[PDB]
Amino acid sequence: SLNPKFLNVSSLIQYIQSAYHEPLREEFKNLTPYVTKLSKVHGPNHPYLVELKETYDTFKNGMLEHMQKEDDVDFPKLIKYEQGEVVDDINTVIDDLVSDHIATGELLVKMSELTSSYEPPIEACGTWRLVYQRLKALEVLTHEHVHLENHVLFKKVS
Ligand SMILES: [Fe+3]
Ligand SMILES: [Fe+3]
Ligand SMILES: [O]
Ligand SMILES: [Zn+2]
Numbered sequence: 001s002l003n004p005k006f007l008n009v010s011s012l013i014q015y016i017q018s019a020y021h022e023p024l025r026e027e028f029k030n031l032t033p034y035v036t037k038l039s040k041v042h043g044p045n046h047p048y049l050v051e052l053k054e055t056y057d058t059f060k061n062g063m064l065e066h067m068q069k070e071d072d073v074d075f076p077k078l079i080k081y082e083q084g085e086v087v088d089d090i091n092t093v094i095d096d097l098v099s100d101h102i103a104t105g106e107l108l109v110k111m112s113e114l115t116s117s118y119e120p121p122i123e124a125c126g127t128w129r130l131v132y133q134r135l136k137a138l139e140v141l142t143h144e145h146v147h148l149e150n151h152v153l154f155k156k157v158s
Helices: 009-041 047-082 091-114 126-157
Strands: none
Touching: 009 047, 009 126, 047 091, 047 126, 091 126
16 A cells, blocks of 8 residues: 655654554553453453453553653654754664563463464353454554554664
8 A cells, every 4th residue: 555665754653643552542441341341250260361351451551651652752752863863862762662562562472372362262252252352453453553663663763
């Protein structure tokens, strides 16, 4: 479709915030209730469900504050850089946002692993099936969100 190579850091940052950050902040606020209900109704007979509320919660958290770092601190440094402005600290700023991505990543591996690649049992209720659906979706979206930053946005500045 549109080759991101032509997008300058400024625009690439904008797209990421309109396509990935903003839609995700809400997705959580809308998905979290369902993930909590599942660990109360079915957690007792299915421990993995209790383990996921946790993982999901700690993922949501890591992702929520890692995204808010990119908006309150790191994107400015990135646009600053594109405008040939002395920043000096960007080399490591990228190396922190890269690690942050590996962290929030292995967490997506566990959730998939716990959910048996998001494949419900024979006893999954609608909510259960719905959660798995919404969750699997939240995995690929962020996989696109992170890939874009890693292999395009960050590489531009480099
Ligand atoms: Fe981001
Ligand atoms: Fe990020
Ligand atoms: O992110
Ligand atoms: Zn079972």
